[PDB]
Scaffold this active site. Structure first.
Site, short mmCIF file in Angstrom:
data_model
loop_
_atom_site.label_atom_id
_atom_site.label_comp_id
_atom_site.label_asym_id
_atom_site.label_seq_id
_atom_site.Cartn_x
_atom_site.Cartn_y
_atom_site.Cartn_z
N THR A 271 46.79 104.70 -6.51
CA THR A 271 47.62 105.30 -6.82
C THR A 271 48.86 105.31 -6.23
O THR A 271 49.17 105.68 -4.89
CB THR A 271 47.10 106.90 -7.23
OG1 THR A 271 45.90 106.76 -7.69
CG2 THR A 271 48.09 107.42 -8.23
N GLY B 145 58.11 83.77 -2.77
CA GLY B 145 58.84 84.13 -3.61
C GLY B 145 59.80 83.34 -4.51
O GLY B 145 59.12 82.66 -5.36
N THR C 284 58.63 93.70 -6.94
CA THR C 284 57.43 94.59 -6.57
C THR C 284 56.17 93.87 -7.55
O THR C 284 56.36 93.98 -8.74
CB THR C 284 57.38 95.78 -6.73
OG1 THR C 284 58.49 96.38 -6.12
CG2 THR C 284 56.18 96.57 -6.25
N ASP D 126 50.63 89.83 -6.78
CA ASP D 126 49.41 90.18 -7.33
C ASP D 126 49.25 89.50 -9.12
O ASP D 126 48.39 89.12 -9.38
CB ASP D 126 48.98 91.46 -7.53
CG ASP D 126 48.88 92.28 -6.06
OD1 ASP D 126 48.41 91.31 -5.32
OD2 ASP D 126 49.39 93.26 -5.80
N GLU E 83 61.06 80.59 -3.99
CA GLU E 83 60.98 79.27 -3.85
C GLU E 83 59.77 78.73 -4.43
O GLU E 83 59.26 77.39 -4.25
CB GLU E 83 61.25 78.95 -2.40
CG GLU E 83 62.69 79.21 -1.82
CD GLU E 83 63.52 78.02 -2.37
OE1 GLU E 83 63.50 76.99 -2.20
OE2 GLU E 83 64.51 78.49 -3.04
N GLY E 84 59.03 79.43 -5.15
CA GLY E 84 57.73 79.03 -5.78
C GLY E 84 56.45 79.24 -4.82
O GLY E 84 56.12 80.23 -4.26
N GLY F 116 58.59 97.79 -12.26
CA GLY F 116 57.37 98.32 -11.91
C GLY F 116 56.36 97.09 -11.42
O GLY F 116 56.81 95.93 -11.49
N1 LIG Z 1 62.88 86.22 -7.04
C1 LIG Z 1 61.85 85.42 -7.82
N2 LIG Z 1 62.20 84.54 -8.77
C2 LIG Z 1 61.14 83.79 -9.21
N3 LIG Z 1 59.87 84.01 -9.06
C3 LIG Z 1 59.50 84.88 -8.02
C4 LIG Z 1 60.67 85.61 -7.50
N4 LIG Z 1 59.78 86.22 -6.52
C5 LIG Z 1 58.62 86.21 -6.72
N5 LIG Z 1 58.46 85.10 -7.63
C6 LIG Z 1 57.12 84.54 -8.00
O1 LIG Z 1 56.05 85.50 -7.43
C7 LIG Z 1 55.31 84.65 -6.49
C8 LIG Z 1 54.66 85.78 -5.49
O2 LIG Z 1 55.77 86.26 -4.96
P1 LIG Z 1 56.03 86.52 -3.49
O3 LIG Z 1 56.92 87.14 -3.06
O4 LIG Z 1 55.54 85.39 -2.45
O5 LIG Z 1 54.63 87.44 -3.23
P2 LIG Z 1 54.00 88.67 -2.38
O6 LIG Z 1 55.06 88.85 -1.37
O7 LIG Z 1 52.62 88.59 -2.07
N6 LIG Z 1 54.10 90.21 -3.18
P3 LIG Z 1 52.70 91.01 -3.91
O8 LIG Z 1 51.36 90.62 -3.33
O9 LIG Z 1 52.56 91.56 -5.06
O10 LIG Z 1 52.74 92.45 -3.08
C9 LIG Z 1 56.17 83.50 -6.21
O11 LIG Z 1 55.22 82.45 -5.86
C10 LIG Z 1 56.82 83.02 -7.38
O12 LIG Z 1 56.18 82.27 -8.42
K LIG Z 2 57.95 93.66 -11.54
MG LIG Z 3 50.46 89.09 -2.26
#
Ligand SMILES: Nc1ncnc2c1ncn2[C@@H]1O[C@H](COP(=O)(O)OP(=O)(O)NP(=O)(O)O)[C@@H](O)[C@H]1O
Ligand SMILES: [K+]
Ligand SMILES: [Mg+2]
Ligand SMILES: Nc1ncnc2c1ncn2[C@@H]1O[C@H](COP(=O)(O)OP(=O)(O)NP(=O)(O)O)[C@@H](O)[C@H]1O
Ligand SMILES: [Cl-]
Ligand SMILES: [K+]
Ligand SMILES: [Mg+2]
Lengths: 311, 315
Positions: free
Chosen positions: A13, A224, A252, A256, A226-227, A293
């Site tokens: 939660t 993020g 956020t 996942d 950058e793919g 969210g």
């Molecule tokens: N600003 C963005 N623009 C486009 N795609 C995004 C962006 N941020 C994240 N993504 C997409 O989301 C994927 C996962 O983002 P990333 O920030 O690497 O995940 P994380 O840090 O593991 N987040 P989370 O596990 O849910 O806590 C990336 O590989 C992209 O495909």
């Molecule tokens: K979101």
């Molecule tokens: Mg993650």
């Protein structure tokens, strides 16, 4: 309805307070908004996969409390099997207490709670469902022995293992790598696991290769905006898969979303190339960042381009 | 069964995480326990008064949510009238997110939430119960304008007003002072209100005189383990009322225990001198510091000395 995707992992939660400033020791501050969200990496991943059309089953443990009862209803409303969602009186439902300021800086306290009490006996009851699945998904938010047993059970039945080492710890049990068919993490997790600095796609490729040499079959590092970068035992040269620029509302939960999408493609579209699966997963995660969210931002199949579901 | 003590004020759900260290900006940490508790200054005060035997009523607003329904049950379990415990779909129940380390130090984030939506219409519906009370207690954890409205209504009906300006605001409307029969605050609140240092009884006496001159009938400044200081229009010389030393286990909620006890005495023993009331209230709050938790630490009448309940002055 045989589940093709089984997630053994966390439900938490999210208790989110929005404030203009973050508190220091001894301070009481007043914020402007509080909300409750459904989270946990396991459940998040499961929800994204289900919304794409997967038949899923969530193996998890929550409390015998209001939060736990509400979580169960959340999984049901997302068409997820709760056959092996357990409840215990011995710990509260897992919680993430999150304070966020208006610049997006945060303080987070996670109490894993009932998640930690999902044990190997609980898993064993799900053996038949695991054996009939296509993909098993695990993270690092429950007790390690339970996740290792889940991965082991999947391997014994030839079920594909998708492991997300999140949150990361420096000295991860070596079996996490050797039991992982697909190992997917972000840049900061890669840094923690390998000790390398990751500031570029090239740097991510170097970190990915360390992870591959520890025993993973396929390694994906998300970057993020950058793919992602991918390499595999059969193709160890890193491939950078970029994503088109979007205007992010809230990143956020994007990781996942990505992992849940990948689970869906691994289970239902196994003949797609890895690169094609990752292109589609990048796109779905980039949709998620364009809404506020976590689970509320995860798109449904009906709201996505048709080409994502063609073979 | 007329409510003699009516508290118009806050209810807050405490969301408590226990950790080995407090996080700083940007940090994610793991704690080892989470639990829910009941707080809010209004409800805390009302609970202590109820436990001493007051017929109480809590005028408050919570969300139409699980936390709000749970809060209503909490008030019922403490024999508090819930006839003016409102619910709203327009905001979540007020929350206090609390992180506590192993030495008991904390960080707290309060989101007032539904408490801020307690409004004029709600007070008008409560007008009859406010008007028939002996004492109306309020704080600053609802909208200030709503506390001012509640003070105004009580004053118009000749009901004794007990105002706790907590948390304090530096530019409080002047009418708060002129509508306060008894104005009771702690050292840190007195500093905000007066712009003086308040560390000692002497300091408190100086601050109290500033507040008295703003129009309060009685000013009380609480001093933690040093008791309290009081003065009044009738007796403007500060009197320090000390408290006997105890072994404190957990001082959380002691101020609200003190105020709830004072409300009880103003309502049920109006004949008593301020000094008498404050000696008794000091003692009850000092009981609360000898037990863990907030509301769970507040003593019941049956577990307290009989001397606390005599109609006449006691030595
Ligand atoms: N600003 C963005 N623009 C486009 N795609 C995004 C962006 N941020 C994240 N993504 C997409 O989301 C994927 C996962 O983002 P990333 O920030 O690497 O995940 P994380 O840090 O593991 N987040 P989370 O596990 O849910 O806590 C990336 O590989 C992209 O495909
Ligand atoms: K979101
Ligand atoms: Mg993650
Ligand atoms: N360590 C202590 N020993 C004895 N009595 C105590 C102690 N701390 C507090 N008290 C009693 O509690 C009363 C109020 O405490 P104080 O610390 O002034 O309240 P506050 O700071 O307004 N607390 P609260 O409003 O509940 O958050 C004092 O006047 C004492 O009667
Ligand atoms: Cl825990
Ligand atoms: K206490
Ligand atoms: Mg106080």
């Amino acid at each position: 309805e045989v589940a093709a995707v089984v997630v053994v992992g966390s439900c938490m939660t999210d208790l989110v307070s929005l404030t203009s400033r973050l508190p220091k020791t001894g301070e009481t501050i007043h914020g402007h908004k509080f909300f409750i969200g459904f989270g946990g990496k396991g459940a998040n991943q499961c929800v994204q996969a289900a919304r794409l059309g997967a038949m899923t089953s969530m193996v998890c443990k929550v409390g015998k409390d209001s939060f736990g009862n509400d979580y169960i209803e959340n999984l049901k409303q997302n068409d997820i099997s709760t056959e092996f969602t357990y409840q215990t009186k011995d710990a509260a439902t897992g919680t993430a207490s999150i304070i966020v300021n208006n610049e997006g800086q945060n303080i987070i306290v996670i109490v894993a709670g009932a998640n930690l009490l999902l044990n190997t006996e609980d898993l064993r009851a799900a053996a038949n469902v695991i054996s009939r699945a296509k993909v098993m998904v695990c993270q690092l938010e429950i007790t390690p022995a339970t996740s290792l047993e889940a991965l082991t059970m999947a391997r014994r039945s030839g079920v594909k293992t998708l492991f997300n080492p999140a949150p990361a710890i420096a000295d991860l049990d070596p079996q996490f790598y050797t039991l992982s068919d697909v190992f997917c993490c972000n840049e900061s997790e890669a840094e923690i696991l390998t000790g390398l600095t990751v500031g570029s796609a090239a740097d991510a490729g170097e970190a990915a290769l360390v992870l591959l040499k520890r025993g993973c079959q396929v390694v994906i590092i998300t970057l993020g905006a950058e793919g992602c970068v991918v390499l595999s035992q059969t193709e160890p040269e890193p491939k950078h898969i970029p994503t088109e620029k979007v205007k992010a509302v809230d990143t956020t939960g994007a990781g996942d979303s990505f992992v849940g999408a990948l689970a869906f493609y691994l289970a239902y579209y196994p003949n797609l190339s890895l690169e094609d699966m990752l292109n589609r997963s990048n796109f779905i995660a980039a949709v998620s960042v364009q809404a506020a969210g976590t689970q509320s931002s995860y798109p449904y199949k009906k709201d996505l381009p048709l080409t994502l579901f063609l073979e």
